[PDB]
Amino acid sequence: PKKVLTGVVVSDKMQKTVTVLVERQFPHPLYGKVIKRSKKYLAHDPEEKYKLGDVVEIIESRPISKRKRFRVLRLVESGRMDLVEKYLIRRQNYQSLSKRGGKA
């Protein structure tokens, strides 16, 4: 079975390519508490169709580029930028923790 994942598009900045963020849930090995983990996958969109806030299914695909081993299968819901937001805010934090800072 070619793996099929489901995530949110969080970047339409590539020609025929989109970043999909996939949320993985599971109990922590030793401590039990069900923890949340996640990864971004660069999926293949040939007709630059899917766009941010989009929730789509990603399917294991034949290589397409160094980093692209997934084509965008179909689309589930859409436009829900609340997620894309969550992702962005977080990334924005990074500018604070370092040598400089960033108010909250």
Binding site: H28, Y31, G32, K33, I35
Partner: protein, 124 residues
Amino acid sequence: PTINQLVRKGREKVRKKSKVPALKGAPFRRGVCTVVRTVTPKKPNSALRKVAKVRLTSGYEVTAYIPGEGHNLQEHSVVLIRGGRVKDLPGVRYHIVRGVYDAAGVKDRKKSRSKYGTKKPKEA
């Protein structure tokens, strides 16, 4: 620590530091003597404990106890170190094995012979 905290930072493994850097952990290690002084014990004890600085193969120079009634170590004696602390001499963490190399086994020894490297005298 909340379970969340534990997930977040988890526990810290306790590494134990060795009390015998005769490098390689190695059972024993050898070197040559650099000095063969004697020292005084501490706290309540008194005596003239015999010791020896040793230029080790592990590339170290440590002070080592010379167990036994009497010894025969001089400026350039080659001996095998084995390590064993000596409570009465701060700084003395290794023992010199008697019966190996230039360290002669204590003679006239009749009991704990295998230690002090002494061959069995024949019952005549």
